[PDB]
Amino acid sequence: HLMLARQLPLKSVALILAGGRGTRLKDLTNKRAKPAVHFGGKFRIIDFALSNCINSGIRRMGVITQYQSHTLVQHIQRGWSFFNEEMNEFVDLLPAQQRMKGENWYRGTADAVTQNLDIIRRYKAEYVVILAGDHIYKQDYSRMLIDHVEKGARCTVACMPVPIEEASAFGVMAVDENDKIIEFVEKPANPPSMPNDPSKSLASMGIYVFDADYLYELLEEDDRDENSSHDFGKDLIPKITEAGLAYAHPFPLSCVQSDPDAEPYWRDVGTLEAYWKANLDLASVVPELDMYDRNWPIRTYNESLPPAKFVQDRSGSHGMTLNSLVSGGCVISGSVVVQSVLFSRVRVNSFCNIDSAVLLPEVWVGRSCRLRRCVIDRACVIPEGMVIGENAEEDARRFYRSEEGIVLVTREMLRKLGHKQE
Amino acid sequence: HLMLARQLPLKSVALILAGGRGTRLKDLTNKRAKPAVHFGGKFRIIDFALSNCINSGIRRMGVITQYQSHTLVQHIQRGWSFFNEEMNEFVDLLPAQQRMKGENWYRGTADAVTQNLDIIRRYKAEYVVILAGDHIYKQDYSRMLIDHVEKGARCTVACMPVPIEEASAFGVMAVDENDKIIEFVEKPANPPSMPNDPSKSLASMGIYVFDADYLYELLEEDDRDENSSHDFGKDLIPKITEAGLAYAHPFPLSCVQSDPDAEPYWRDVGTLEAYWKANLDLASVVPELDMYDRNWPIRTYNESLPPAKFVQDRSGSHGMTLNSLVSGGCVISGSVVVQSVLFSRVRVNSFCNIDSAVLLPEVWVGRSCRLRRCVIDRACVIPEGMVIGENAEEDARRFYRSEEGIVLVTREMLRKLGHKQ
Amino acid sequence: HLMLARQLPLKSVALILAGGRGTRLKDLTNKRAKPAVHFGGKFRIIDFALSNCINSGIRRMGVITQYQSHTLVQHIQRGWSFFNEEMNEFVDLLPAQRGTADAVTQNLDIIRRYKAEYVVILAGDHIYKQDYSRMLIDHVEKGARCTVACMPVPIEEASAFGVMAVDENDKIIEFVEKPANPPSMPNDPSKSLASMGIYVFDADYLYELLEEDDRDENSSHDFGKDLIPKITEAGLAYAHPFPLSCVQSDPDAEPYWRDVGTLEAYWKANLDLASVVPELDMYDRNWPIRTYNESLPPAKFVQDRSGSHGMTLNSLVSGGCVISGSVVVQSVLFSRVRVNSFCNIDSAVLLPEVWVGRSCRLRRCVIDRACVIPEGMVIGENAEEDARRFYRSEEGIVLVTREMLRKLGHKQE
Amino acid sequence: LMLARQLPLKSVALILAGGRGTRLKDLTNKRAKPAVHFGGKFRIIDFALSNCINSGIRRMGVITQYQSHTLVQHIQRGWSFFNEEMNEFVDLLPAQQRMKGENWYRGTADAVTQNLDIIRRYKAEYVVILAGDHIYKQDYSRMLIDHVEKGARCTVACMPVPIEEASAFGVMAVDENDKIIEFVEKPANPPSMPNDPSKSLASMGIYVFDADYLYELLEEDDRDENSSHDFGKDLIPKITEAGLAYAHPFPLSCVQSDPDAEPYWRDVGTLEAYWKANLDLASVVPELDMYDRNWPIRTYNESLPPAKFVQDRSGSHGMTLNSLVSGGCVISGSVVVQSVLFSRVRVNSFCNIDSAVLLPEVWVGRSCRLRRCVIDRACVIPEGMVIGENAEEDARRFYRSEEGIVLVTREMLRKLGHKQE
Numbered sequence A: 001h002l003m004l005a006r007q008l009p010l011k012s013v014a015l016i017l018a019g020g021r022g023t024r025l026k027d028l029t030n031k032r033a034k035p036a037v038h039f040g041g042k043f044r045i046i047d048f049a050l051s052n053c054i055n056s057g058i059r060r061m062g063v064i065t066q067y068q069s070h071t072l073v074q075h076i077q078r079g080w081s082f083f084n085e086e087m088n089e090f091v092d093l094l095p096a097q098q099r100m101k102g103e104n105w106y107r108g109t110a111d112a113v114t115q116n117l118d119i120i121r122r123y124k125a126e127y128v129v130i131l132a133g134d135h136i137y138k139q140d141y142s143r144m145l146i147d148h149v150e151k152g153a154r155c156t157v158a159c160m161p162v163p164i165e166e167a168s169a170f171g172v173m174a175v176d177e178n179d180k181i182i183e184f185v186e187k188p189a190n191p192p193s194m195p196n197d198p199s200k201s202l203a204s205m206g207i208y209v210f211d212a213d214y215l216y217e218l219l220e221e222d223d224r225d226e227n228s229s230h231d232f233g234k235d236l237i238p239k240i241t242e243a244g245l246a247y248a249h250p251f252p253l254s255c256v257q258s259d260p261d262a263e264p265y266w267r268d269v270g271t272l273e274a275y276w277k278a279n280l281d282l283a284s285v286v287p288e289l290d291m292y293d294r295n296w297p298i299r300t301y302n303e304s305l306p307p308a309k310f311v312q313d314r315s316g317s318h319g320m321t322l323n324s325l326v327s328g329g330c331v332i333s334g335s336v337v338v339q340s341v342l343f344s345r346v347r348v349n350s351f352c353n354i355d356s357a358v359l360l361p362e363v364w365v366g367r368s369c370r371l372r373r374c375v376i377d378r379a380c381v382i383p384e385g386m387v388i389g390e391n392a393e394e395d396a397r398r399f400y401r402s403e404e405g406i407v408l409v410t411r412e413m414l415r416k417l418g419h420k421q422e
Numbered sequence B: 001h002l003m004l005a006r007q008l009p010l011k012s013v014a015l016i017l018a019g020g021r022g023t024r025l026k027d028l029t030n031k032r033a034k035p036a037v038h039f040g041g042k043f044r045i046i047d048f049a050l051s052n053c054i055n056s057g058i059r060r061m062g063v064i065t066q067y068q069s070h071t072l073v074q075h076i077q078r079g080w081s082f083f084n085e086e087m088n089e090f091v092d093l094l095p096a097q098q099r100m101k102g103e104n105w106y107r108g109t110a111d112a113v114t115q116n117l118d119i120i121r122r123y124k125a126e127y128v129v130i131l132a133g134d135h136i137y138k139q140d141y142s143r144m145l146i147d148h149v150e151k152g153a154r155c156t157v158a159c160m161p162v163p164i165e166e167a168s169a170f171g172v173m174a175v176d177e178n179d180k181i182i183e184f185v186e187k188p189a190n191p192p193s194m195p196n197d198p199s200k201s202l203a204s205m206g207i208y209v210f211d212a213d214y215l216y217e218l219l220e221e222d223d224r225d226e227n228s229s230h231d232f233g234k235d236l237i238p239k240i241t242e243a244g245l246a247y248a249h250p251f252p253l254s255c256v257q258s259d260p261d262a263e264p265y266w267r268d269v270g271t272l273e274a275y276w277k278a279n280l281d282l283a284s285v286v287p288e289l290d291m292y293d294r295n296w297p298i299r300t301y302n303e304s305l306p307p308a309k310f311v312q313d314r315s316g317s318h319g320m321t322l323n324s325l326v327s328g329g330c331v332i333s334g335s336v337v338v339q340s341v342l343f344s345r346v347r348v349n350s351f352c353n354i355d356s357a358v359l360l361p362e363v364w365v366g367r368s369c370r371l372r373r374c375v376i377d378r379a380c381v382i383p384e385g386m387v388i389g390e391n392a393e394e395d396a397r398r399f400y401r402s403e404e405g406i407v408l409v410t411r412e413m414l415r416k417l418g419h420k421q
Numbered sequence C: 001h002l003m004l005a006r007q008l009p010l011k012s013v014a015l016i017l018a019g020g021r022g023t024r025l026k027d028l029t030n031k032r033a034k035p036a037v038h039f040g041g042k043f044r045i046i047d048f049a050l051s052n053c054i055n056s057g058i059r060r061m062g063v064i065t066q067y068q069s070h071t072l073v074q075h076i077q078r079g080w081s082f083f084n085e086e087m088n089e090f091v092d093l094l095p096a097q098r099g100t101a102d103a104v105t106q107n108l109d110i111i112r113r114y115k116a117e118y119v120v121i122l123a124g125d126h127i128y129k130q131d132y133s134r135m136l137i138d139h140v141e142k143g144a145r146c147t148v149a150c151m152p153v154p155i156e157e158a159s160a161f162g163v164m165a166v167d168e169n170d171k172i173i174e175f176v177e178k179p180a181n182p183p184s185m186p187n188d189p190s191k192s193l194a195s196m197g198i199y200v201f202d203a204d205y206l207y208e209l210l211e212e213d214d215r216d217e218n219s220s221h222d223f224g225k226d227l228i229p230k231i232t233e234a235g236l237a238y239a240h241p242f243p244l245s246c247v248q249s250d251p252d253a254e255p256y257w258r259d260v261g262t263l264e265a266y267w268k269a270n271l272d273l274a275s276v277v278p279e280l281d282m283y284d285r286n287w288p289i290r291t292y293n294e295s296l297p298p299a300k301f302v303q304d305r306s307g308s309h310g311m312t313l314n315s316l317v318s319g320g321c322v323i324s325g326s327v328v329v330q331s332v333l334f335s336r337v338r339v340n341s342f343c344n345i346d347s348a349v350l351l352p353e354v355w356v357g358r359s360c361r362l363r364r365c366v367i368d369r370a371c372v373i374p375e376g377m378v379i380g381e382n383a384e385e386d387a388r389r390f391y392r393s394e395e396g397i398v399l400v401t402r403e404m405l406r407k408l409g410h411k412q413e
Numbered sequence D: 001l002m003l004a005r006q007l008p009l010k011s012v013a014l015i016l017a018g019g020r021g022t023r024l025k026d027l028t029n030k031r032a033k034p035a036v037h038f039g040g041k042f043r044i045i046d047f048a049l050s051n052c053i054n055s056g057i058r059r060m061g062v063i064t065q066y067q068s069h070t071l072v073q074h075i076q077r078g079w080s081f082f083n084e085e086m087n088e089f090v091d092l093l094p095a096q097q098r099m100k101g102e103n104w105y106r107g108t109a110d111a112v113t114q115n116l117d118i119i120r121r122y123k124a125e126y127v128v129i130l131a132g133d134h135i136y137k138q139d140y141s142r143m144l145i146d147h148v149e150k151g152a153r154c155t156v157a158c159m160p161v162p163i164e165e166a167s168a169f170g171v172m173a174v175d176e177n178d179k180i181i182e183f184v185e186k187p188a189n190p191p192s193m194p195n196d197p198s199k200s201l202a203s204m205g206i207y208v209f210d211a212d213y214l215y216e217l218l219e220e221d222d223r224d225e226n227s228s229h230d231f232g233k234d235l236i237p238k239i240t241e242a243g244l245a246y247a248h249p250f251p252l253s254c255v256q257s258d259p260d261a262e263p264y265w266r267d268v269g270t271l272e273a274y275w276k277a278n279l280d281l282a283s284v285v286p287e288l289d290m291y292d293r294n295w296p297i298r299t300y301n302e303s304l305p306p307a308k309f310v311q312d313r314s315g316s317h318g319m320t321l322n323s324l325v326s327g328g329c330v331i332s333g334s335v336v337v338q339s340v341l342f343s344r345v346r347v348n349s350f351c352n353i354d355s356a357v358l359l360p361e362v363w364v365g366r367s368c369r370l371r372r373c374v375i376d377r378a379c380v381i382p383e384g385m386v387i388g389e390n391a392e393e394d395a396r397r398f399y400r401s402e403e404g405i406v407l408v409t410r411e412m413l414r415k416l417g418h419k420q421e
């Protein structure tokens, strides 16, 4: 009658690291934090980490923000503020400030947790689950908690093989036959390859399980360390590995997926192309990421919208759709929409051709537009007859064009070109 | 009198009569009350009266149910239970029992209010707004409250000209130069015409404003009256008219509409054909009912659904859509959808042709189906290759077929034909 | 396998039988169902079964209602309507119009669509804390088709319960419903092994069992009288000792469970919360009880008409109360209770909105909703006078309602 | 006709809930002033927000001019029940404290200017500017009517204050039409009111603006090299010079039960004033009526056990005189007089508490005596400690005001060697 599998999440608290400032998504995060980035027609990226907590039995969450992110706070307020504190459940907004240890010496990810240590101790959790709020994945944290307790570990790090050519952006580790971490290097310019596979490196997913009291001591010591950068990957994980108290958790043990024969899904959405790719996956016939799984639902802000409306064009002609998502509030006049994802309240006027495009909420596409392989940002007013995705040189002049050929259009770019955004 | 326009809704309580069976809707109301009938891809009919209350400043509502309406109670529970009683706001579920006065003498709508009189008196309301919960319309009751007080009336009846050929279903009235009601007949077989116009009759909309303490007295007397059918239209309104204390409120004074040049919108959704018509109106290019007006929004249960998904069919071909509404959770594989309204989580498989059809939530349409001029009820599993709307006699044998040719399909009908549900 | 303890509640649905009339509660249930009976200064009885479900991981609940259900439905609407169905959680209001099993059978179409693997049947008119997830594990490990939670009870009151006999494997061997001559437990004649009205069912097995019962013209359609004996004869029923799953702070204490059948038991259970060390711990954050969080002003104590202070001894005073001096002893005051000057209130339960006039003395009594006690009235000191004006139980507990006071000529407006 | 009801619907309220300060001493070391506990169960910002709701203004922007953890959490818990589709919300609008010089602070108007993009999209016709750190009841809809009837571009709520305290306020002079003729912000020598030298006509920091006019004014002010970007110091005098500013006497819209009483308004600037305003609610006849159902104050509805009174260790009863005891409290015997105990306050045996304000989660040890003091959140008072009886000893251990009111925090106790966990 052992109940440990059910008791561990109740004794745990999840801490979601929700963003230090960055700019790898370019203008896409100019006016919004990365965890607040739109995804899947109706979600924001942070919804996945939070929904993973709820579905894993962890109903106490702390979302740590490193600056005043308006749209992230509003999203938490409107879609993640339904809890009753008397039932041992909450979503706390924990403000961190970016602190410097020197003129150009930044304090790290661990410092954001250290600043809020007084509030976190009062949670009286036995286990602390540290999460990155800017990744898209489904994982059962209760299974990782079970693995963490079974191994007698003080710190357990979720791990996953990644292509070695992209491993320099990750913490890379080496483990023994017991999944105990033997070596750990943070963002190596020369990433060690996995034994028996030089094409891959064993990478850290930024997902940790901690003994609570051990984490408090470690942060107290780290805060007083004059040599530390106060970063989980750069400072804390190597130190725990050296003490022999750190273990690895292979992601397939806890990744939640409908098709058991498939590869484990995990997207860090680092580049504009990866973001564009991850959204369009949901529009394909067989998406890699299953969002119709009632057994692991993703919670978000339930926006009240009119049903998607399709009307004849100015010539009275019908519209055509091929492998596309049309969110609520959209109004499409004829046109051709193919391999695309349209967020809420998107207006597509007559005689349009939209192919492999991601249109964020409130986008207004004027008459006779052709958009290909692009991302149209919030509330853009595309002027009539505009063509995007057909002339590489012209696209790069007007907007942002990635090396792979993916175009990003914002209100500021269009206004710069003389197209009114009212 | 400075702040009266704002104070009146705060001193008012709305009673929504939601016991309607709507038998003329046939199997559509076999397992649900008429106020719980689906509409507009994402609403139920009762949402309009309740949203009208909220937008009018009347945040205290009593929904009277004349039996055990499970799905009506659940809808109120899901989408209309967000109120905080300490802020002088609530939506109360007030159960009434259907009572008989004789062998086949049914007590009326007023009896349902009388049964709950103890609870209603405790509201301490100064004005009571009586509403029908089975109609679709937008109205600002605060304008009617101002009109009611300025006229010094004890009872104010919202009225609107209707075609005389349909006026026998309504209470018909005649008014003087001051909007005071002079004559009133309830559901006349030969409806009196308006003096200005023999093509129209001045009809009652079943929407009343009452002086609260006057309403209580009237119901107490009516409960003891051995000659009364205990009905608002058949009994109470004629009595108030005879006393000279009843006044009329022209609907255009308070009807909310985007286009001021248009005709006032009001649908009683009495027949299957009218219900089918009112739904498809929203799919047209310029709908008569504007559901995109942010200035008078309609509140409902905000169901969490995946975005509407369109995928290629088995042959890898695209889909076509013409003047149609596709709600969230739907997944459409190719096919042709024209002049149709699809509610939530409707599944349309490959090679389908759907024309002038209303598909209620969770309908599963199999491969190679053709549906025309029909209403498909909740959770129907249409078997592969089924054709509807092309053979009039065949449709009438399998399902219900309206006089004008509109077909209604339910789970029970398909189960009788041997199609597993 | 290793995740079974967590996955069983997610595959379960709880059905709360909340049509209870509570005949032995007299006027206390004249205008309200027994699950809607006030308790603990701020709760309704049904809150415990529902809170037990939430704390057990069972977030899908069906509340079956029937008699005098207005105040019960409103309570569910106010305090138990915060769920988001997309996260596989709800509290359904299932109206029933023949015994307890018939109410479940009537709603069988809706319940099947829950697609539950296990069904937990609960009585919504009892006060207790239980972890149903532990009972679910025991149900699966025993391979049972039906598991019945059991507890030893004094044999002199065992005729009100279903009594059972079990073997060495907790398999139910004999079962009799409400026996006039209750069999005693082996090795203890002072006690009988009683059923708590709490069952765990294999879902598909329960549906079949209800289908057969509906077609049985000889059945009374009752869980205890009809279904449990049938399962016992087939050898498919098992017993679950309540201490396995009973939730309690003090591990040395006796398992807490109250059916509050009589006015005296209801009065007793309320005053227990006012004692120094209550048997029922309502300060345990590890098993909290959810209810309607009513917005109330903080309890206000003011000087009496003579400018004197007030005295309190082992009492609970809910929000919105305003007490003018007076003496309140061993009492429980619900929300918005007004106690005027020069009053003496001892061993009394005052339900919400009670107005106590000046110079009143109330002892060993329960005053019902919104009663307006006139000035100088004395209750609990003259037995015969109490019995003439109000209801007086055999043990001497007095029940006062607004209707009784109105009959005596005391205005209730 | 319907103007009285339409004006709040066309308005948006901006609550200024930021601005660092230290007039409350350690009381605001770890919380913003709008987040300061009050009345046993409220935070100060609840009044402005409740005034908006009760005035018909359901769209609110709370500007937080820095990172106030406990203020955001309170909004998240008690003011996040809105449905945006029904034209209602409480927005958290982040402002940062901006400098114009080495010690030249940009003012309250700058915080509104920073969020001008978000505010314009509200598409409001009128903007109501509110201070989120004051305690008062006011019907903003009455002030909106007065603003429109006077044809004003800006209307300033005003009231007479004692001239010896008027230097902390904006002081104004008005003509016979309540038009503002002279305005000076925080004068060292405040002008007296005509016909009463004991009083000055003061600004309450409550403004009604024509929305587009305010946006123009803020655009110009953001580009003004001479402006401190403050409503009182910069904007109001500028509008006054143009002759477009009007005054609104507070009694026109102040909400109060007793019509014969003086208008209630507290800025709670000092520890003594804060202590005073709390204890007023514990008196026999409080100046501020918190039992008025017609103007309820909304807050975080925290789930708490009923206030529990138990015998002390010697089995003796407890005594209470003119006190408020919030939910979750557990008092063991003891004597509680003229005090206000917030939620979850634990008072052990043999205690004497007089004229004291005990904030949430305070644990008072055995045999303690507290007088004329405010004990902050979660203080663990050690056994036998005495406060409020020795002025010199009190000033050494804690903070002691001029008037003799003592403030105790967890840090002060831990500094004295008394464990706080």
Ligand SMILES: Nc1ncnc2c1ncn2[C@@H]1O[C@H](COP(=O)(O)O)[C@@H](O)[C@H]1O
Pocket: A031, A032, A036, A071, A362, A378, A379, D118
């Ligand atoms: N309809 C809109 N028009 C212009 N700006 C907007 C609109 N909606 C949001 N924004 C702003 O654009 C940025 C992106 O916000 P969001 O899409 O909510 O993450 C934020 O600064 C928003 O305030």
Ligand SMILES: Nc1ncnc2c1ncn2[C@@H]1O[C@H](COP(=O)(O)O)[C@@H](O)[C@H]1O
Pocket: B031, B032, B036, B071, B362, B378, B379, C109, C110, C113
């Ligand atoms: N998916 C479904 N399958 C079968 N019956 C259903 C389904 N959804 C609802 N019902 C039943 O249909 C009746 C009315 O449904 P509705 O008003 O659409 O909720 C009720 O008896 C429901 O229990």
Ligand SMILES: Nc1ncnc2c1ncn2[C@@H]1O[C@H](COP(=O)(O)O)[C@@H](O)[C@H]1O
Pocket: B119, C031, C032, C036, C071, C353, C369, C370
């Ligand atoms: N203040 C009140 N005055 C009179 N009757 C009431 C009051 N509050 C509730 N009731 C009624 O008393 C009965 C039982 O109330 P309750 O305590 O809510 O279960 C129901 O019929 C209620 O409608």
Ligand SMILES: Nc1ncnc2c1ncn2[C@@H]1O[C@H](COP(=O)(O)O)[C@@H](O)[C@H]1O
Pocket: A119, A122, D030, D031, D035, D070, D360, D361, D377, D378
């Ligand atoms: N129980 C507690 N013990 C210690 N500090 C607390 C406690 N509750 C809140 N605080 C802190 O006290 C400060 C102000 O609290 P409050 O404004 O009451 O939420 C914040 O820094 C809180 O984190």
Ligand SMILES: OC[C@H]1O[C@@](CO)(O[C@H]2O[C@H](CO)[C@@H](O)[C@H](O)[C@H]2O)[C@@H](O)[C@@H]1O
Pocket: A109, A132, A134, A169, A170, A171, A172, A186, A187, A203, A204, A205, A206, A232, A233, A234, A268
């Ligand atoms: O995950 C968010 C963010 O954290 C950083 C460090 O700032 O990297 C962390 O997470 C990585 C996986 O996402 C780990 O591999 C790494 O060890 C850890 O420091 C950023 O690189 C990343 O975007």
